[PDB]
From a paper:
The eukaryotic Structural Maintenance of Chromosomes (SMC) family includes the protein complexes cohesin, condensin and Smc5/6. The Smc5/6 complex plays an essential role in the resolution of recombination intermediates formed during mitosis or meiosis, or as a result of the cellular response to replication stress. The Smc5/6 complex has roles in the processes of DNA replication and DNA damage repair; the complex acting to suppress / prevent formation of inappropriate structures that can form during homologous recombination-mediated rescue of replication forks that have stalled (or collapsed) on encountering replication ‘road-blocks’ or obstacles. As well as containing subunits that provide both ubiquitin and SUMO E3-ligase activity (through Nse1 and Nse2 respectively), Smc5/6 is further differentiated from the cohesin and condensin complexes by the fact that the two non-SMC proteins (Nse1 and Nse3) that bind to its kleisin subunit (Nse4) belong to the ‘KITE’ family (kleisin-interacting tandem winged-helix element; 15) rather than the distinct and structurally unrelated ‘HAWK’ family (HEAT proteins associated with kleisins; 16).
Here, we report the cryogenic EM (cryo-EM) structure of the six-subunit budding yeast Smc5/6 holo-complex, reconstituted from recombinant proteins expressed in insect cells – providing both an architectural overview of the entire complex and an understanding of how the Nse1/3/4 subcomplex binds to the hetero-dimeric SMC protein core. Here, we have determined a cryo-EM structure for the budding yeast Smc5/6 ‘holo-complex’, in its apo or non-liganded form. Our study serves to confirm the overall architecture of the complex, plus provide details of how and where the Nse1/Nse3/Nse4 KITE-kleisin subcomplex interacts with the Smc5/Smc6/Nse2 core. Additional experiments also reveal the presence of a crucial interface formed between the head domain of Smc5 and Nse1, which utilises the equivalent of the ‘W-loop’ or ‘F-loop’ found in Smc4 and Smc1 respectively. Notably, mutations that alter the surface-charge profile of the region of Nse1 which accepts the Smc5-loop, lead to a slow-growth phenotype and a global reduction in the chromatin-associated fraction of the Smc5/6 complex, as judged by single molecule localisation microscopy experiments in live yeast. Taken together, our data uncover an unanticipated degree of functional equivalence between KITE and HAWK accessory subunits.
Residue numbers in the entry:
A (entry chain A): 35 to 100
B (entry chain B): 98 to 213, 215 to 289
C (entry chain A): 896 to 1068
D (entry chain D): 11 to 336
E (entry chain E): 9 to 99, 114 to 152, 173 to 303
F (entry chain B): 970 to 1104
G (entry chain A): 151 to 249
H (entry chain F): 40 to 124, 184 to 202, 213 to 245
């Protein structure tokens, strides 16, 4: 591809935990994402992992996807 | 620190080194470099920037199971001055401060009178506790338990003595062959 | 019994030599492959170590049997005393964490993995080691074939030398 | 003589176990060692007389040495006879304690009884030549030299740049500075300057060379330390060894315009220079950065004991306008 | 004046030869870094190189070698010896005719001195640790131990027997980097081979493959003085003059055909 | 007797907290499976089927069960709160105040971050909490 | 839903494997606790699993290597016993001939 | 005899002193090869264990087994030394041992100190030296 392999694009979450809707126009260059939790940044990582055939138990915050 | 008849339930918040408090208490019984978390120099065993690591332990024997109450005093003052250089000084005082002993061998005698670190179940490190409570599956649970029961070490020395018995049998064989040769020459010289 | 033994002996020796030849070929395969593996991994990670301005190496250990082989780390910053092995005994956890950071960096260097994610590992780390992690991300941006990089941090510090190929983010939560 | 010739042989042999550099007093002890091996000892000599014949032998030696493009020089250790002899009698104490197990002879009793007169001199058989076999040291590969030369350059830079701050009393150099100051002036609370410099830093930069693995690095360093080319401070810093110095002394003197002592006019990398920058200013008649005048520690002691407490390049208040040199 | 005049004439021959100086320079460099023997071919090769650079016709090779030997005696009391070939070991000083060459230290003891060196090094080790000098010292020490092994082995001991005796003295045969030396004993062995201290014998028995024994290499053999060996052993056990000749003959037994005497 | 009493004490502690079961102490495999039948569970399933806090409490109860027959009159424990639960810590303090209150022989060096020794019910006779001056 | 086509998780796992991505593997994805576990993982085992994250063909190669080592030990002890047996049988047969 | 702390600890103490005395006979046997030490230590440990009969603390069994191993080696070595009146095998250890002053099975300090010293004192190889001028270029 023109970009590096597996380059992510804007990700749309909907009805997730608290986020009824949201969309992140991600960056192919770099991501120095700095900031603590409070809206579920770890839950955001769990969302990314589970939505891509990844077991949430890699971290272990919440298990059941539903 | 305030203690007495009651156990050492150290309520030590963050910044007091609760695990470090446990390690200092353990070093009260002579821990080594890999069981002290302080390295070759003993400066960090003392307060960082201090020299006189004073371990003062008034041990009163006015209850069940008294050790030398008329000799070591009713109380016993364990005084371990762990310093930056040289071996740590020791003083096993009586109730009135009379230093009955100056070494931890009498502490060992008192403990054996009381059984009050060698066993993993006895003393567990942060890594050991983490392995026991989080990094222990049925096999690892088994290993932790057997070590704590010393059953692992038990069987260790068991088969170690067994191995030396095999060595002993080899000695039996070789030395018996030598005896056979000597007795063969003996009998031939007889005849 | 001797007939049985003397019949089996040539066969047993033949099987032993078949083994030996297989082992020799396995050495000739892995040992150069592992050589490149460890050599270039260590080269990248230690050059990054120096970019930090810190002492750290990763040595491969190959005893007589492959089952005995392993990888160890041996680092140093305190100039007062010479370098020794880096393990989980007495060192600061932040040093080991940065070592793992360089570990995954070299993994990207070698494995097909075309992008990087760091999931808030920097919890409990001090100012210095987290700044080191940030500069590791900078060097990730300083490398060629700019891939996708992600690092999750709770806070940010001052004195962050920046460049153009990079893209600083901010996770909001 | 053949006796003396073989003597000098054995001397050089020790020198090889001394790997090329030997103490004045250690040489003396070897002398007594040899005279016990020779049983020719005549008790009636002051240590000076032994020194005399020692040096006579030395001259015969260096006669031939000069025939050989190699040579022994006697110098005085820059840390000075007193500090040298302090550390050396810390081990002469360990020595007489170890020899009491062997002090079954009156010779050994005399040896332990002869308190060593304080002396910082060493003798060094050193190359005088640069040709094929010379570069054919065969010690190790080329990178090791180039990088070590680089580190030497780093130490040169370190020495040149003066660092200001409290003196490291951890350095015994400062201790003996103050001791000499009290001995000469009697001012027990004389104010110390905060101006000082040294080469020993840069171990951190040993680990800043990037062209080889850290292991190999350390190991080569261990060789050198064993080979006593550089030296380890207990703070972790490294300087370059006195004998190693004499070698590079002359080469670097050529390469960097290195000013020598002022009294003995020998280059010393430790001692006392003038903290007045005007003494360390460039001599404008030359256009060269003129490092501040500095005597050997003994040279400084004799000067102040007999000449002045003011600089000559600048005249400054060397009581206050000095610089400790490490 | 014998030394003075002799060294004077030496200096004269030096006026005819600075080449010898450079030669010993390379000699001692190669050794010190390597502890090395040198081949006749290498000698004459560097000699011809020098003759070209000196731009002087090549004089007698025997001349040259004798001259430098005398040089480093009057300066060093040493003898340059060449070795008889390895082919002469399994099938007048030759000098110019000898093939492999090294330097030998030609003085006797000075007992008190060596012991005092013992004393200094005792301070050393007691202070040392719970190195290259000492590193090689251990290397040589294991060497000497093994030498004694082969001597009780009558100049013949197999590989594995040696391995067991190494384990006998707590030597980790696991294949780890050697304590202090950070290498494998195998590499030590290969050194003694290249340093000609040992002989490795490999024979293809059709039942057990290649069986390997070992014998004493001529570096040690030329090194190994008889009286040196004997008084060495006396000093091993702190012995008096009583068992002198008795253990002397016991050592003769331990030798047997150990040397191509 | 140690395995027997360890299983018995494990069951007793679980009943005090609520539970029962067996220990598959396979020496040959050197694996200590802990098949505990719990009210929170269905059958004599392994403790791995329990919750993380439940598994931590089960491990703690098994460890105290191990302590029970051993000839040790001294035990220590530190750095466990980080990978456990405060409910488990409180239940352990209750177990100490109900067992170590009469165990005047074993010296328990147990280290906790919070001042749970005097906040919770762990002080009693025999051996129990004593004042540690918080920083 | 691959391109908004509903499927199970197996196809997405195949995609993750084919994308050079492993959200599970620590070499590509781990946490701080996993980082410290890595800091305590067996150097042998940890190195092996990293290699697996790179190559597993050589992993099985090594496994067969150790297996062949075990077979070698077994067969070697067998050869030793056979040698001792042969020698003893020869001596005993000599005795039988004498008898 | 089932659980007296005094008996157990005195067994410990006697066994530790026994270990010290057996180390003494270790060097005794290395120089000479006496079997009486082995047999008597065996008898001592067995008698103490007989007192430990009924007492059931693991550490005592472990240390007793240590004693067992040591005594068995003692006896085997002494028998080997008894069979005939090897010597180098005795000597090299003694060489190592006599280079073992210590305060009174890893590799000692003066072990290698003595050995290397000996070789130097005796090597017919002359010592060597090196330098840097010319590699200094
Ligand atoms: Zn001036």
């Amino acid at each position: 591809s023109s970009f590096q392999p597996g380059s992510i694009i804007k990700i749309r979450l909907q009805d997730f935990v608290t986020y009824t809707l949201t969309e992140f126009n991600l960056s192919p260059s770099l991501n120095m994402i700095i900031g603590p939790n409070g809206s579920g940044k770890s839950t955001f990582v769990c969302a990314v992992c589970l939505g891509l055939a990844g077991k949430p138990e890699y971290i272990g915050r919440s298990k059941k996807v539903e | 620190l305030e203690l007495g008849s009651r156990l050492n339930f150290i309520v030590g918040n963050n910044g007091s080194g609760k695990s470090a408090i446990l390690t200092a208490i353990t070093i009260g019984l002579g821990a080594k470099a890999s069981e002290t978390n302080r390295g070759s120099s003993l400066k960090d065993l003392i307060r960082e920037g201090c020299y006189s690591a004073k371990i003062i332990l008034h041990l009163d024997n006015s209850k069940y199971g008294a050790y030398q109450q008329g000799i070591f005093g009713n109380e016993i003052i364990v005084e371990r001055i762990i310093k930056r250089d040289g071996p740590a000084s020791f003083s096993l005082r009586s109730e009135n401060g009379k230093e009955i002993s100056n070494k931890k061998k009498d502490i060992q005698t008192v403990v054996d009178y009381f059984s009050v670190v060698s066993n993993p179940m006895c003393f567990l490190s942060q890594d050991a506790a983490r392995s026991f409570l989080t990094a222990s599956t049925s096999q690892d649970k088994y290993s932790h338990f057997m070590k704590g029961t010393l059953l692992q070490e038990i069987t260790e020395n068991l088969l170690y003595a067994s191995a030396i018995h095999d060595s002993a049998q080899e000695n039996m064989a070789l030395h018996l062959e030598n005896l056979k040769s000597l007795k063969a020459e003996y009998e031939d010289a007889k005849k | 019994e001797l007939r049985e033994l003397e019949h089996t002996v040539p066969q047993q020796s033949k099987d032993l030599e078949t083994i030996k030849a297989k082992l020799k070929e396995d050495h000739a395969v892995l040992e150069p492959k592992l050589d490149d593996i460890v050599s270039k991994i260590s080269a990248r990670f230690a050059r990054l170590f120096n970019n930090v301005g810190s002492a750290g190496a990763v040595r491969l250990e190959k005893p007589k049997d492959y089952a005995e082989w392993k990888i160890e780390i041996m680092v140093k910053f305190r100039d007062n005393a010479p370098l020794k092995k880096l393990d989980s005994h007495t060192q600061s956890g932040g040093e080991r964490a940065v070592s793992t950071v360089l570990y995954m960096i070299a993994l990207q260097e070698f494995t097909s993995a075309p992008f990087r994610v760091v999931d808030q590992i920097n919890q409990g780390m001090d100012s210095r080691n987290e700044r080191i992690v940030h500069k590791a991300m900078v060097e990730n941006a300083c490398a060629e074939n700019t891939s996708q990089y992600f690092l999750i941090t709770p806070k940010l510090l001052t004195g962050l030398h920046y460049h153009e190929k990079m893209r600083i983010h901010c996770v909001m939560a | 003589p053949v006796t003396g010739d073989a003597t000098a042989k054995y001397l050089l042999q020790y020198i090889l176990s001394a790997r090329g550099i030997c103490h004045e007093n250690a040489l003396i002890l070897a002398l007594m060692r040899l005279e016990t091996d020779a049983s020719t000892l005549n008790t009636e000599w002051s240590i000076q007389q032994w020194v005399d014949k020692l040096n006579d032998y030395i001259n015969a030696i260096n006669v031939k040495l000069n025939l050989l493009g190699y040579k022994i020089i006697r110098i005085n250790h820059g840390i000075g006879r007193n500090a040298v002899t302090l550390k050396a009698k810390q081990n002469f104490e360990s020595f007489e304690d170890n020899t009491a197990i062997r002090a079954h002879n009156n010779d050994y009793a005399v040896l332990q009884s002869i308190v060593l007169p304080e002396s910082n001199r060493f003798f060094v058989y050193v190359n005088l030549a640069s040709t094929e076999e010379t570069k054919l040291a065969t010690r190790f590969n080329q990178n090791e030299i180039e990088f070590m030369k680089w580190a030497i350059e780093q130490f040169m830079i370190s020495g040149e740049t003066i660092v200001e701050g409290p003196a490291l009393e951890t350095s015994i150099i400062v201790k003996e500075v103050n001791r000499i100051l009290v001995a000469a002036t009697g001012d027990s609370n004389l104010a110390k300057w905060r101006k000082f410099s040294t080469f020993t830093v840069g171990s951190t930069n040993l680990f800043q060379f990037q062209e080889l693995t850290a292991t190999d690095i350390e190991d080569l360093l261990l060789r050198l330390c064993e080979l006593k080319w550089f030296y380890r401070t207990q703070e972790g810093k490294f300087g370059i060894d006195l004998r190693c110095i004499a070698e590079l002394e002359e080469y670097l003197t050529s390469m960097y315009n290195l000013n020598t002592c002022q009294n003995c006019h020998k280059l010393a990398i430790q001692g006392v220079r003038c903290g007045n920058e005007s003494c360390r200013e460039e001599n404008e008649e030359t256009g060269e950065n003129s490092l501040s005048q500095i005597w050997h520690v003994d040279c400084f002691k004799h000067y102040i004991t007999h000449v002045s407490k003011n600089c000559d390049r600048c005249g400054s208040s060397l009581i206050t306008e000095g610089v400790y040199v490490i | 004046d014998v030394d003075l005049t002799e060294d004077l004439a030496v200096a004269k021959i030096v006026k005819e030869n600075p080449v010898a100086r450079k030669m010993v320079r390379y000699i001692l460099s190669r050794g010190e870094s390597q502890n090395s023997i040198i081949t006749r071919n290498k000698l004459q090769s560097v000699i011809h190189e020098a003759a070209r650079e000196e731009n002087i016709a090549k004089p007698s090779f025997s001349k040259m070698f004798m001259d430098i030997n005398a040089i480093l005696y009057n300066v060093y009391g040493f003898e340059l010896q060449g070795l008889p070939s390895k082919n002469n070991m399994n099938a007048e000083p030759l000098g110019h005719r000898a093939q492999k060459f090294i330097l030998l230290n030609n003085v006797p003891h000075s007992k008190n001195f060596d012991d005092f060196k013992i004393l200094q090094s005792a301070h050393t080790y007691e202070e040392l640790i719970v190195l290259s000098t000492d590193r090689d010292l251990v290397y040589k020490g294991v060497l000497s131990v093994i030498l004694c092994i082969v001597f009780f082995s009558k100049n013949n001991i197999l590989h594995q027997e040696l391995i067991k005796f190494l384990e006998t003295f707590g030597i980790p045969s696991d294949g780890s980097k050697i304590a202090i030396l950070n290498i494998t004993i195998e590499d030590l062995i290969k050194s003694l081979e290249k340093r000609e201290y040992i002989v490795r014998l490999e024979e293809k028995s059709d039942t057990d493959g290649e069986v390997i024994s070992y014998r004493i290499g001529r570096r040690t053999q030329a090194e190994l003085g008889l009286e040196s060996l004997e008084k060495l052993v006396q000093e091993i056990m702190g012995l008096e003059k009583e068992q002198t000749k008795s253990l002397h003959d016991d050592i003769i037994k331990s030798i047997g055909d150990s040397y191509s005497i | 007797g140690t395995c027997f009493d360890a299983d018995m004490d494990f069951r007793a502690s679980l009943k005090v907290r609520k539970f029962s079961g067996n220990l598959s102490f396979i020496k040959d495999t050197k694996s200590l499976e802990i098949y505990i039948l719990t009210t929170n569970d269905e059958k004599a399933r392994n403790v791995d089927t329990l919750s993380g806090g439940e598994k931590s409490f089960s491990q703690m109860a098994l460890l105290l069960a191990t302590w029970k027959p051993m000839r040790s009159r001294i035990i220590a424990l530190d750095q466990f709160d980080v990978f456990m639960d405060q409910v488990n810590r409180k239940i352990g303090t209750t177990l100490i105040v109900k067992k170590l209150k009469d165990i005047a022989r074993t010296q328990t060096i147990i280290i906790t971050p919070q001042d749970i020794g005097k906040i919770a019910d762990i002080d009693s006779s025999g051996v129990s909490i004593h004042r540690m001056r918080d920083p | 839903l691959i391109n908004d086509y509903q499927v199970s998780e197996s196809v997405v796992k195949t995609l993750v494997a084919q994308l050079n991505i492993q959200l599970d593997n620590l070499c590509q994805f781990l946490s701080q606790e996993r980082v410290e576990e890595f800091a305590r993982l067996k150097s042998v085992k940890l190195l092996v699993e990293t290699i697996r994250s790179i190559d597993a063909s050589l992993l099985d190669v090594l496994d067969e290597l150790r297996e062949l080592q075990g077979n070698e030990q077994s067969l070697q002890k067998d050869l030793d016993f056979k040698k001792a047996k042969i020698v003893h049988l020869r001596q005993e047969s000599d005795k039988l001939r004498k008898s | 005899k089932d659980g007296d702390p005094q008996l157990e600890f005195k067994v410990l103490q006697g066994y530790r002193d026994l270990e010290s005395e057996m180390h003494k006979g270790r060097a005794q046997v290395t120089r000479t090869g006496d079997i009486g030490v082995a047999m008597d230590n065996l008898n001592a440990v067995d008698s103490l264990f007989n007192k430990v009969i009924g007492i059931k603390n693991n550490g005592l069994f472990a240390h007793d087994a240590r004693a067992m191993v040591s005594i068995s080696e003692l006896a085997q070595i002494s028998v080997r030394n008894l069979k005939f009146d090897a010597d180098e095998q005795s000597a090299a250890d003694q060489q190592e041992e006599s280079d073992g002053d210590i305060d009174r099975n890893e590799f000692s300090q003066f072990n290698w100190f003595r050995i290397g010293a000996l070789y130097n004192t005796i090597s017919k190889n002359a010592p060597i030296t090196d330098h840097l001028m010319g590699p200094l270029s």
